[PDB]
Design a protein around this nucleic acid. Structure first.
Lengths: 54, 122, 92, 72, 50
RNA sequence: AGAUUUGAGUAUCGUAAGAGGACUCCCUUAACUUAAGCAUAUCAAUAAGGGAAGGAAGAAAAAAUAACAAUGAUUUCUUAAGUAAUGGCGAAUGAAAAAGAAAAAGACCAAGUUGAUA
RNA sequence: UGGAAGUAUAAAUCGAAAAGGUGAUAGUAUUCAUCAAAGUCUAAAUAUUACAGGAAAACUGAUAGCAAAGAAGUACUGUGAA
RNA sequence: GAUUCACGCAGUGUUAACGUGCAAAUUACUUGUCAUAUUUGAGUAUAGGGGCGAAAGACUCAUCGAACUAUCUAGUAGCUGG
RNA sequence: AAGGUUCCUAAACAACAUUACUUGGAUUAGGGUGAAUCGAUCCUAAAUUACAGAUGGAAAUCCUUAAGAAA
RNA sequence: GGGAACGGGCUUGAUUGGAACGGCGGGGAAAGAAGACCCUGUUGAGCUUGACUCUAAUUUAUCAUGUGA
RNA sequence: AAUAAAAUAUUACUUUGGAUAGUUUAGUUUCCUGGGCGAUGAAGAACGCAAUGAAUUGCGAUAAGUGAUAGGAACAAUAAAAUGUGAAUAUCCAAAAUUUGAAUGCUUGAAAGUAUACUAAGGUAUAUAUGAUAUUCAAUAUCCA
């Protein structure tokens, strides 16, 4: 799916917070918030260059 | 469920409503029996009568609606509840006759120069 | 060699894939077959003239055109109103 | 006093339940619903809110009178 | 509040109705995985936002 | 008083609205980015905003090409072709006739004529 | 806009015809070629990642594949958009 | 729009307590103030190159020398890590 | 105002209230909110929103009695 | 001592019994934070100004045919 | 010089945890057919209905279902009743279809409501724009007596 993994509105928290600069999910109230984002090394993100049907 | 459709269909118009008065009253006392600690046999009777009321009403409405359709079958102005079943789009599209209308000049040409049948020798 | 690639625009939404090409052959063929079954000379591909190509590059090659001129039908003694009904293309 | 202390006076509702979408998104002073776009006849939908489109749209409900029509 | 609209009280009452658990007989159906009602809330645990 | 003109209220029979917008036809003067800076340019009929429909929609019957031993409505595919051209002629942008195929179909208004005129 | 002394649209002004447009280097003239604008409809060949019903796969096999293989846009967060 | 005390309010000092706190700004004593340029509830009005400001670039939902949220967007990095 | 069954009773104490609990605003199950005179409903205040009209490429904006054979 | 010129580990020596309690604040160049001072990016943002290129508002001339001298 | 409480080392068994292996009623992509909504009230939202249901599912005051047509003996967690004189099950069918929603007599905040006409209650109609016809009018607007 062309939208797989990239269906979030995540931005990196920056520096100064003792956490890595990988983008992080936004909001609160769930365990998903504050977790990793699109990057291919994370969980539930996109993979390396995704397979294309063409 | 013990009312039978044959018994209902043979009833008169007044016997339709006369039975319904008793059936509603019978269920009304059965609702009290559920509240006041009734036996399971009385509870099973509650479920039966409810379907009897539904069964009785279905025949009452169908018979009257069928009579209504026979009333307005010849009527020029028919109520929307008796018009043929169609989607909103279908009732807006032109009829098959109107879609195939031809001008007199074009209609007469199709009768003088129609598509002839033929073949070619190889 | 100096490269000239017009991929700076969004080509991924400009990509057209021909996966329907094998099924296009079956669809078109089943229409020609089912057209003759209606009336066999329906797909007879009504007769077309033998016209020259344009430009000096192709001027010596003959190819099919569309429709005979009204002078060609008169030279061959054919009614122009009846020509279209017997599988003859006409181009006034 | 912008943190813990200032939260004590929050007892006046800004949004209440809306009549067309059922969400607590009806702004009382603005007299419009932030979610379903009330009295405005057209439902409020935006292309940037693609997730908001897949949460309330056709097929997310009972489809009481359209399930038969398409089946027919 | 003590004062409420008619529609608001009925939606208040339904929230009371839905704060219940699985009946015991339902838990004894064959192939049953529904043992708890995960849509449960308590007045001092979560506000229902209404 | 009467013959007309225009504009209203009421009654009857209908019509529009809203959902969906993957594909279709359009309105709008975004920016990040590239140019190793940047201001025209590129990104780019692109994003977001707005309107309208169908099962397809749009186009369609030359005030069209061409300069030939000439063609001939519209649509789509191959090729022409990263070519002619455009560009701080920088970065970059960039068609079309011919030629080969899929399918093929042409009909009307206005103007003119006929008026014991309908 | 590829259209370069203007390819197309629009606005201000101006504004034709005993017709005329085009032949992309502006201008006048004479020939030549080819059409006849400023009204309308028109099937077939073409597109489709809405949605519904099916069939396939050198696709993934529960941190993978849709966010969702269980009452998943559900639990939970925010005044709200989200 | 005098001087003070009280119910309250503020926040001058201890640069006291606490500083993985009762508390993402609180506590104790001390100090100032404690009705007309006063204190305060509800309703209502003003919205992002905008608003409001007895003016500190202050306040605009713990976010302000330009809020929050979603899309362009996997913005770009001659720089850092693998 | 806000909360929403937290109110009362009985059974029961696995979890929760930085020990423990026979206690509980915690678990389970029932019960409980009675109006001609109390309020909403009625009136208008700051302000707010409609048909027609005016404006705008557009969504929409303006006007609240002025423009209207309307109120 | 040498070493990246201030070692817990290396070299040479001084010296060492295993487990630890209450204190304290020398060291661990202690913890908290991809230095905020300085510099470099052909990286930005607020503000100012006859910095360059523009723009709303303002202003001026012509056009858009009311009649009679 | 000395012990092995602590400390360390390997193996076996147990524990906390859920990797690995086996598996799939779930997804992804392509293709084929359609692309069938709504004032005859749509999509969406709310409330309600099972003998014991909180969710979910199905349904709408005829309620986890009614009639008709096919269908032939079940359901089950526990009781009951009904049942080949027809149980489950199925459907482009019929009757029925609460409050709202373009929402449309007027108002609507979480608002309880309410006016007229027709056939005490119940049920219909009454929004805006709009095409055609009928009808009642207004304007010395053009004539004309």
């Amino acid at each position: 799916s062309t939208e797989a993994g990239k269906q979030h509105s995540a931005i990196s928290w920056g520096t100064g917070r003792a956490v890595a600069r990988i983008p992080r999910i936004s909001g609160s109230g769930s365990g998903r918030n504050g977790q990793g984002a699109f990057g291919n090394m994370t969980r539930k993100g996109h993979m390396f260059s995704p397979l294309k049907n063409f | 469920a013990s009312l039978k459709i044959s018994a209902i269909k043979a009833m008169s118009k007044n016997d339709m409503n006369a039975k319904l008065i008793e059936l509603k009253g019978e269920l009304a006392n059965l609702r009290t029996a559920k509240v006041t600690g009734g036996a399971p046999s009385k509870i099973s009777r509650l479920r039966v009568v409810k379907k009897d009321i539904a069964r009785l009403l279905t025949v009452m409405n169908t018979q009257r609606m069928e009579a209504l359709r026979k009333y307005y079958k010849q009527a020029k102005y028919v109520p929307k509840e008796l018009r043929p079943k169609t989607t909103r789009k279908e009732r807006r599209q032109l009829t098959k006759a109107q879609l195939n209308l031809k001008t007199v000049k074009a209609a007469k040409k199709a009768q003088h120069f129609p598509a002839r049948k033929f073949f070619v020798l190889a | 060699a100096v490269s000239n690639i017009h991929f700076c625009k969004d080509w991924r939404s400009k990509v057209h894939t021909w996966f329907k090409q094998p099924f296009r052959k079956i669809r078109r063929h089943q229409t020609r077959v089912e057209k003759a079954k209606a009336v066999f000379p329906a797909t007879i591909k009504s007769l077309k003239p033998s016209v020259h190509c344009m430009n000096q590059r192709f001027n010596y090659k003959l190819r099919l055109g569309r429709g005979f001129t009204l002078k060609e039908l008169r030279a061959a003694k054919i009614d122009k109103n009846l020509a279209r009904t017997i599988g003859i293309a006409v181009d006034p | 006093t912008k943190g813990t202390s200032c939260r004590g006076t929050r007892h006046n509702k800004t949004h209440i339940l809306c009549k067309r979408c059922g969400k607590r998104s009806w702004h009382l002073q603005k007299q419009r619903c932030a979610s379903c776009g009330y009295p405005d006849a057209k439902m409020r939908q935006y292309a940037w809110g693609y997730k908001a489109l897949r949460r309330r749209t056709q097929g997310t409900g009972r489809m009481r009178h359209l399930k038969i029509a398409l089946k027919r | 509040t003590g004062h409420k609209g008619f529609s608001y009280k009925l939606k208040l009452g339904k929230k009371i109705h839905q704060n219940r658990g699985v009946p015991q007989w339902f838990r004894m159906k064959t192939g049953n995985t529904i043992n708890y009602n995960f849509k449960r809330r308590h007045w001092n645990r979560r506000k229902m936002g209404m």
